[PDB]
Subunit: 115 residues, 4 copies
Amino acid sequence: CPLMVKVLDAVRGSPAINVAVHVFRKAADDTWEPFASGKTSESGELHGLTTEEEFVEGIYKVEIDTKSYWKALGASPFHEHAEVVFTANDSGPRRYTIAALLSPYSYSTTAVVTN
Amino acid sequence: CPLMVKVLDAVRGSPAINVAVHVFRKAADDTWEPFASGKTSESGELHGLTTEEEFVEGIYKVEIDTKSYWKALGASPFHEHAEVVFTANDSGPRRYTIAALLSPYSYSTTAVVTNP
Amino acid sequence: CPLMVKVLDAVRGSPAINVAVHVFRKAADDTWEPFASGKTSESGELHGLTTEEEFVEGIYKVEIDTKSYWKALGASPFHEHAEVVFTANDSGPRRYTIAALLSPYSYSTTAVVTNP
Amino acid sequence: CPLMVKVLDAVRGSPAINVAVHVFRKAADDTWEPFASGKTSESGELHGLTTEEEFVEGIYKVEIDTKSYWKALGASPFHEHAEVVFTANDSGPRRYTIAALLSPYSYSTTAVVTN
């Protein structure tokens, strides 16, 4: 699996479960076109987003619909969503894990890129 | 100043200087329309982006140009930029401070919102 | 002020007010000796902990009493406190700002170090 | 496994590998006594720290020797180490994953507690 997304909840200290995640790739005319999407599991992870063949170099945006997540749990969300924008670079064989740590008014995201 | 941005470099333990920041605001046609932009100073802070009058209700997107910042310092960053999207002044004017902590492959961003 | 602490609440998007902070400094016998303590103000900042004269070289430990802070606000935090340990003024006096971002089960802490 | 530790490197966007981790439990006289320790693997993880039987309620401190880690890679570390202090509470069945994200002058730590 070339691209993984893991989402954690910093309030409850648990994985962010029923979370919608949309991945877009930047089209030649700079528009963002749907690339992949899904909902985090009970482990806060989303696998099977794409395949090695489809995941070509280019700019990608991982959009995490955090607002709905926090609303369900009664917290008042700050962000509309979390946006992770990056360039997939082939240079060598790589796997991407976009990790996101969420709080109502804050979030962190790290990219773990392994061989 | 109703919208400020402060950026820190977690590798150097100092303000993130000369970081370009672009603010957009969702238009009626769901298009991201340019709202304001600037760059952080020696203290890693960006003030004067907009005024209370101009900063009306809306969904804003604050794009912090992290990639350009790291590249200029000789690093190989992962992200293109940090994108902070949020609805503003939904219940009256508020002062927003968008803080961002930067590392080549990871960044934190957290808003401090106060009633003026 | 050579050692400042600033704390933010990532759940409320505001300064972390009334947060007790205890500073210790490793003694000759490797014991943690009390150095200074205080609590953050309405702006989530703690100034006046020590002076340049008193803040000598050494390994310091800044304990941010996060648990007491969350409990008082009705939350069930994971950590007892945030512990920032670091060697200070190893190459001359420096001004240190220990910043901490708090959530019930997670916290970030990052130092901004500048030459006066 | 009751207690896990995962360490990531935010500079290189990879797991913090050869990292020493010491776990201490607070003794009745408030001193910190050795409880467990090891070195993160190639996946930046440390399993087998303790057993369900030995992991009793109490206050624990996870010390991550980050200074040596950064020195090896040529970065100038700020912290002597990362310290995660917490109370193990039985109330229900739980697993602890102490995650730490490291940067030379900054680090984050989250506690993921699952059933």
